[model samples]
Target: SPAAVNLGTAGNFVILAKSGISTTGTTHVTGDIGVSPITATGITGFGLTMDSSNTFATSALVTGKVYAADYTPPTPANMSTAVSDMETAYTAAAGVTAPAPVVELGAGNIGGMTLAPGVYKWSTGVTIPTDVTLAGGANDVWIFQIAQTLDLSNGIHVNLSGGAQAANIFWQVAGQTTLGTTSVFNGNILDQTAIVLNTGATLNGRALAQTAVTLDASTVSAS
Candidate 1:
């Protein structure tokens, strides 16, 4: 019996060839057909690329249209699962702690807050009582003592109104920084972990997460 495979979605699809078996097949991408012994094939905007060595048709033929893949929302468990999966990758990294939420040059004070560079264990979460500003003054660094996750809620903004360059607002995040939908974040979000930007939210910093970073179709620009 001939095995049938369904190709869907208009994105980068990779196919791997099994060992010892010289499999020959034709790939259809967006309705286009190509000969075997080829690396990849495209129908319309859709395309398929070979990961390992595979024999493809020498010539390509256009016949059918390519279908786009459905977008799947990340479940709460999936988010946590991804974070757990990355623990091994950042095991050697340091953890963050805060004796208290420390603030710098802001209307409030977050003194003695310390955090490391992996997912934190703090689930109650950290809150910025007042407008937190990350300025470029001598003591303008507001380090977040993070643990598992940092939830920025209650209309918090890492304001960079001082224009002190994005580097000044150093957010030493450990696990993930889940920005609230209505929350606004300013300054540079430097994370050794992942940064998940929710929908309808705005981030004024470059989300430089060492691990995976997700942008929820929100307006995120480098400030």
Candidate 2:
């Protein structure tokens, strides 16, 4: 016999089973849920699911994968370069069109940078005047648009101190983000460009780029 569970609340719940459990409609688990001994009939909308086979009607949004300690970053050639260039171009275009200074974060300034999700023009290049830091509450999302190579000086740290997951920090760059030797970078890097982790550098998060991600035989792990 199969059992049906009815749950109603804007909170969180968890279900554990040695065999299996089945359900219909949208199952919303607020906090975290773990299921084991999953058969081929398992399905999910969000979070993690461990089973023989699982499918989603829409795209499956996953922050991390169970059973896998490390995550695989994206790989695309000239990805970093492309991002940097586009960002520069975006800034240049904005400059040519506007008579006065526009408060944006781009080629010349960091204060007025406001970009929506999607590909944009960047060409001048990305410059981190100081150590760039991404800080916010939990689950907050922030993405950066770069047009040229991202240069992180030696000993520079792109600290993601907010303890947010890597998915929150998106790098919509058109170029390569090069981590200087012995530099430290935190959070997930979703690059439309390439990622270069120099020797002795430490990066915490996955690099999902359009080009190949190069690790210099150093320490690179997931958060």
Candidate 3:
């Protein structure tokens, strides 16, 4: 059976950028945002929105708090735990046995297709240059293992079917991941490097990037 990765403490955040986080314009995040192993100053573009009292920014109007590297005592400690847990979770997810993909999508792009409940893999970069569908039951799970990069183009989306939920989907990318402008993306994006959400992009799941995460007027929430 397809399984879910234990996020551990890292699951507490909707956006976790291990290195840095940069934002532009009015980005609305309904969940907690965290930047770890880096100074809180690493989160840019919302100095006025920052609630220094709480170690979080109020600009994005996050319903949840924020975590950074230099937000006093407990905050930094908590972030350390969260970041460590994030790396642990990444390792566990990537280590999920062999013959890992139900469909070995080879080493290219994925779009204009329906994906079922199974683990998928890409040997190189994964591109979603068009519309894609994930057709499966609510309980069904899908995991994508990419050894390289993952990218989605402008206005593209990952559509759901048969009561599918974004929480049940995970994309494990070994390199950089980008969400193009005005794109609506589903599923948790677990990237080993950086993640860039372009202007007007939205996410229905977590963006857990190991390196940096940059956003522009995006909406992100936990699934």
Candidate 4:
């Protein structure tokens, strides 16, 4: 049975990565960002924007401190732990054998349809080409297990009605995940590989990537 993925300390992060994180432009991130086994140099585009307060603004402004393998005591160690937890959560989400209700909306190119709360499994990949709707309550949970990749088209938004919260939606992608330019998205993305947020993309959830996480002009907030 698929269980709710526990992010642990990683939950406190808006962006968490293993290989590293690269960013450019004037992006605003509302929460902590961390990278493990890689130094802050792995985070680029903020060269002229580094401040004594650990604030980085390459045009991009991160509201929280950046943690990397080169930071002091609790920093690098905490990030290491968080990265480990991310892996654990990814495994748990991906290992779930779908129940009967979870088999339907797992695989497909979901465009303009309303979705409900359940454990959905996709053995291939998932592409949202249009505005997709998720109808549910705050307490309801939706887990999407994607074995390959995930692609969200430009300006395609994931609409949530009936009080659906971004915290309750989980997307476990085994391969790369791409959020197109100016796209609006929701849910916690547990990506097995890299994740890229194109220009002006907005994410209301977390991006936890096993590899690098690249972001352009965008805003990402942990929900």
Best by TM-score: 3
Q: Write the per-residue lDDT of candidate 3 for residues 1-223, one digit (tens) a residue.
A: 3887777888888889978878887788888888988887877775535565766555545667777887767788888898888788778777776435654573466788788778786677888988889998887778888888888899999999998898888888899989999999998888899989999999999989899989899888874
The lDDT of each candidate is: 0.37, 0.40, 0.82, 0.82
Per-residue lDDT, model 2, residue 178, is 76
Q: Could you give me the TM-score of model 2 versus the true structure?
A: 0.46
Evaluated at residue 78, the lDDT of candidate 2 is 23
Which one wins by TM-score: 1 or 2? 2
Tens-digit per-residue lDDT, 53-111, candidate 2: 32211212323222211112121112223333333433433333212222234553332
**Once superposed on the true structure, which residue ranges of model 4 sit more than 4 Å away at CA?**
1-3, 47-60, 98-101, 104-107
Better of 2 and 3 by TM-score: 3
**What's the distance in Å from true for residue 182, model 2?**
0.9
* Candidate 3 lDDT (Cα, 0 to 1): 0.82
lDDT by residue for model 4 (33-117), tens: 8788787777766443544544322323777767777766767678789989999999988776655445536356878879887
The model with the greater lDDT, 2 or 3, is: 3
Alpha-carbon shift of residue 6 in model 1 (angstroms)? 47
Clashes of 1: 41
Q: Estimate each model's TM-score.
A: 0.41, 0.46, 0.91, 0.90
RMSD of 1: 16.7
Backbone clashes in each candidate structure, one number apiece? 41, 50, 1, 1
Q: Where in model 2 is the C-alpha error above 4 Å?
A: 1-123
